[PDB]
Amino acid sequence: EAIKRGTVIDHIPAQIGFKLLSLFKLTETDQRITIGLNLPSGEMGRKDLIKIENTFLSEDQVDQLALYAPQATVNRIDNYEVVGKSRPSLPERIDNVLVCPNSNCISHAEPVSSSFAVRKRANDIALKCKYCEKEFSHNVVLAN
């Protein structure tokens, strides 16, 4: 169910919508939000869907979605019309939302934002910690 002005994130995989809502604190706002989870989609099986009024995502904000919903589409909406359309591209760095798998990483106990360099690989994505300089499969970083 649509809106007048704002952003619509379409084609999010099942079980990722709520994850996105959590990681990116998207509901910490006063704006009207409309969410669909486990909606039917012949397009891809089944999908989650997020709609936020009067709110817009910079290219990089969109890019931050890439690790979780690579094939999502981000539509801009004004006067009920789709005005813009983009897709998430792998970013160079991912800040703030991952946590280092290294139990000894200085980044745990201290007042700094996590940060990783992002590097495309054959069968996974490599994440390198700004701080401890160790590199991990996104599978490891992302699974808990």
């Binding site: 990483c105 200085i106 401890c132 160790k134």
Partner: protein, 310 residues
């Protein structure tokens, strides 16, 4: 300026071939003609959150040799898990209003890097951050190699021991690989092989490396023979069992070495190098250790003194 003035020295992987050269050049310059008043009126903090005596004595001596004053602390088996309340960030935010540079060693990977984010204009030099980095160790290694061989290209270098955890051999290999034509020879107790990222790195740069099981295979060809330090828990009584002696280098193992071959070891050694090699012309680990004061003088000189004219 000079390229390193007011920069942090946190990780080897942040330094160009040029940077490396600059440091070594400076080192040799200072080694040849001392400047005991180069950093007169500087105060440097020697912050050893993790005790390491060898490393601190070296660093502090360097500061004194350049005329600077030193204050600091070595730390202790920490009662109740730390300063506990006080973040490292608050510690560095404070200490960095007192002093002109911060040399720090810390049990957590990434500590040096986090310090820079709070040190302001005060350069921080990493003296060891858990199992991550130890740039001055690596720089003194390089400097020893260059000084005795006359060069950092076209060398035959063998690494020996625990290659899985020898952070010294990872760093040194990375560095040398910023240079042309070196060929590498890796030797492990089967167990504890070399990290695949390092080998992959060598291949793209197009660099020769060979795997081996004893030193005999390689002894007649090498210019440097670098030994890692080897713990009691790193290994066990069961894998010290049939082949533990190449893990013990003896004077006899050296009969066919090139005359120029030097044996480096970052120290301390426990049993992996027998004392009878000490008397050979190849033993060079003590000399290596004394070169640390030049590598370290160099870093401190370049980082605090705008234009360093040799």
């Amino acid at each position: 300026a000079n390229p390193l003035y007011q920069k942090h020295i946190i990780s080897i992987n942040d330094l160009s071939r040029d940077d490396l050269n600059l440091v070594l050049a400076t080192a040799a310059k200072l080694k040849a003609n001392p400047q005991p008043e180069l950093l007169k009126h500087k105060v440097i903090a020697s912050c050893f959150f993790e005790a390491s005596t060898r490393t601190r004595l070296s660093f502090e001596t360097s500061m004194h040799r350049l005329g600077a004053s030193v204050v600091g602390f070595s730390d202790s088996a920490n009662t109740s898990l730390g300063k506990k309340g006080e973040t490292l960030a608050d510690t560095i935010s404070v200490i960095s209003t007192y002093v002109d540079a911060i040399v720090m060693r810390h049990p957590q990977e990434g500590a040096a890097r986090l310090a820079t984010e709070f040190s302001g204009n005060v350069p921080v030099l990493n003296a060891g951050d858990g199992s991550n980095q130890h740039p001055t160790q690596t720089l003194l290694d390089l400097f020893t190699i260059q000084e005795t061989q006359g060069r950092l290209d076209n060398l035959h270098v063998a690494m020996v021991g625990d290659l899985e955890y020898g952070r010294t051999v990872h760093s040194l290999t990375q560095a040398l690989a910023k240079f042309d034509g070196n060929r590498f020879y890796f030797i492990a107790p089967d167990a504890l092989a070399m990290p695949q990222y390092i080998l992959d790195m060598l291949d793209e740069k197009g660099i020769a490396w060979s795997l081996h099981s004893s030193i005999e295979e390689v002894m007649a060809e090498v210019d440097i023979l670098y030994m890692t330090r080897v713990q009691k828990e790193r290994l066990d009584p069961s894998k010290y069992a049939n082949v533990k002696a190449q893990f013990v280098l003896r004077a006899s193992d050296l009969h066919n070495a090139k005359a120029n071959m030097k044996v480096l070891h970052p120290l301390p050694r426990v049993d992996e190098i027998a004392t009878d090699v000490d008397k050979t012309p190849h033993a060079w680990y003590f000399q290596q250790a004394g070169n640390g004061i030049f590598a370290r003088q160099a870093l401190l000189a370049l980082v605090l003194n705008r234009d360093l004219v040799l």
